């Protein structure tokens, strides 16, 4: 199997520096400029100051007061993402989109050597957009994405089999990639930190992790991945018939669901509210709207509407929100 993983370098910030010459070479931090704003991404200059994604923006401003701080120009970024994925599909149809800036390609049945292929991705992308892309090459998805993130800025790295876990030993498991930021500490707490300390030495998905650390993944590049539903629910602390607290939950659900839609590059037209009542029954009601929606407050408005005209007969112990009837590709 010949697996390539592509990953744009500081995507939003690089787009901003490409569209604004006067921002080049300087720290650029793209994110939410309001109160609880969070860094979406920042250029490699800015990372030298200690800024990283998900960091609160007021901190980033403290670390880098002279930095250029920008809001998220979502639609411009999606433009550039489409003109990159076009090259990706032109190279081969076996493309598994991961995100607005990440794909896998299964080039096992392509003539050119994977190294030449990655070189062509790089060239084609920088000619089309001015941006650099880090490319990984291996026989796996796990390894190919390790290789793409490795020589991260404008990188290119092959990982063949001979370098089965030997080269992975010094990796901090923070960079596990495979499944991290959920065992950031329950492994730093139980004393092992390097893949070395865990190399073939909780989540009950360890059969992935212990296998992934080896050269073994086997999961296929999945073209044609279709999401039918996206949702969130919460079992409640106590039973309730108070539409007000139910709707606060719906509000927070709307935010989560909006974020997942936006990340998936999708829109929705049906909103579903779900309750579990005190006699263990599940009730759902949905509304369909004419115009595609993706914004947290739009989803929330439909959901709030649904809840208000429900007439709860029994006490509620679970509340959930769901979106379906999704936009294409
Ligand atoms: Mg990226």
Q: What residue ranges define each of the domains in the chain, with the CATH number in brackets? A: 3-8+76-212 (3.30.70.270), 11-73 (3.40.1170.60), 229-326 (3.30.1490.100)
What is the Cα–Cα distance from 212 to 118, expressed in whole angstroms? 23
Locate tokens 């991961």: which residue?
98
Report the separation in Å between the CA atom of 9 and the middle of ligand 1, taken as the mean of its atom positions.
Answer: 5
What is the Cα–Cα distance from 137 to 134, expressed in whole angstroms? 10
DSSP element (H, E) containing 69: strand 68-70
Residues 6+ apart with CB under 8 A from 35: none
What is the Cα–Cα distance from 78 to 100, expressed in whole angstroms? 7
What is the Cα–Cα distance from 4 to 262, expressed in whole angstroms? 25
Instruction: Choose the catalytic residue: 102, 161, 252, 313.
Output: 102
Please answer whether residues 57 and 32 qualify as being in contact, where contact means their C-beta atoms are separated by less than 8 angstroms: yes
Q: Let me know if 102 is a catalytic residue.
A: yes
DSSP-H helix ranges across 37-184: 44-48, 57-63, 74-91, 114-129, 141-150
Map residue 301 onto helix, strand or coil.
Answer: helix
Residues 6+ apart with CB under 8 A from 304: 247, 250, 251
Please answer whether residues 322 and 228 qualify as being in contact, where contact means their C-beta atoms are separated by less than 8 angstroms: no
Report the separation in Å between the CA atom of 145 and the middle of ligand 1, taken as the mean of its atom positions.
Answer: 11
Residues 6+ apart with CB under 8 A from 125: 84, 87, 131, 132, 133
Kindly give the pairing relationship between strand 133-138 and strand 39-42: unpaired
Rounded to a whole number, what is the distance in angstroms from the first to the last CA of the chain? 26
To the question of whether residue 157 is assigned a binding role by annotation, the answer is no
Report the separation in Å between the CA atom of 99 and the middle of ligand 1, taken as the mean of its atom positions.
Answer: 9
In Å, how far from its chain's centre is CA 15?
18
What is the Cα–Cα distance from 73 to 71, expressed in whole angstroms? 6
Backbone angles phi, psi at 307, to 5 degrees: -65, -45
Largest CA distance in the chain: 65
To the question of whether residue 217 is assigned a binding role by annotation, the answer is no
The resolution, in Å, is 2.6
To the nearest 10 degrees (0 to 180), the angle between helices 11-19 and 74-91 is: 100
Give residues after which the chain gaps, C-N over 2.5 angstroms. Answer: 201
Report the separation in Å between the CA atom of 31 and the middle of ligand 1, taken as the mean of its atom positions.
Answer: 15
What is the Cα–Cα distance from 15 to 57, expressed in whole angstroms? 19
């Amino acid at each position: 199997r010949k697996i390539i993983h592509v990953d744009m370098d500081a995507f939003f910030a690089s787009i901003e520096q490409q569209d604004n010459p006067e921002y080049r070479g300087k720290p650029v931090i793209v994110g939410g400029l309001s109160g609880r704003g969070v860094v979406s991404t920042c250029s490699y200059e800015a990372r030298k100051y200690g800024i990283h994604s998900a960091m609160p923006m007021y901190m980033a401003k403290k670390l880098c007061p002279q930095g250029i701080f920008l809001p998220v120009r979502r639609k411009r970024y999606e433009e550039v993402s489409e003109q990159i994925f076009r090259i990706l599909y032109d190279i081969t149809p076996f493309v598994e989109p991961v995100s607005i800036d990440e794909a896998y390609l299964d080039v096992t049945h392509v003539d050119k050597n994977p190294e030449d292929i990655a070189l062509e991705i790089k060239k084609r992308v920088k000619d089309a957009t001015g941006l650099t892309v880090s490319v990984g090459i291996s026989y796996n998805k796990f390894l190919a994405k390790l290789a793409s993130d490795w020589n991260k800025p404008d990188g290119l790295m092959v990982i063949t089999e001979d370098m089965v876990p030997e080269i992975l030993k010094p990796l901090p498991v923070t960079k596990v990639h495979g499944i991290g930021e959920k065992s950031a500490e329950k492994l730093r707490s139980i004393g092992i930190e390097t893949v070395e300390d865990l190399l073939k030495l909780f989540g009950k998905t360890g059969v992935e992790i212990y296998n992934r650390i080896r050269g073994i993944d086997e999961r296929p590049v999945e073209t044609m991945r279709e999401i039918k539903s996206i949702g969130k629910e919460k079992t409640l602390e106590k039973d309730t018939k108070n539409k007000e607290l139910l709707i606060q939950h719906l509000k927070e659900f709307s935010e989560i669901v909006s974020e997942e839609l936006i990340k998936e590059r999708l829109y929705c037209r049906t909103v579903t509210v779900k309750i579990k009542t005190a006699d263990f029954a599940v009730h759902t009601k949905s509304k369909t709207v004419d115009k595609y929606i993706r914004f947290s407050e739009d989803i929330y408005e439909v959901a709030k509407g649904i809840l208000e005209e429900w007439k709860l007969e029994q006490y509620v112990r679970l509340i959930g929100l769901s979106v379906s009837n999704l936009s294409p590709v």
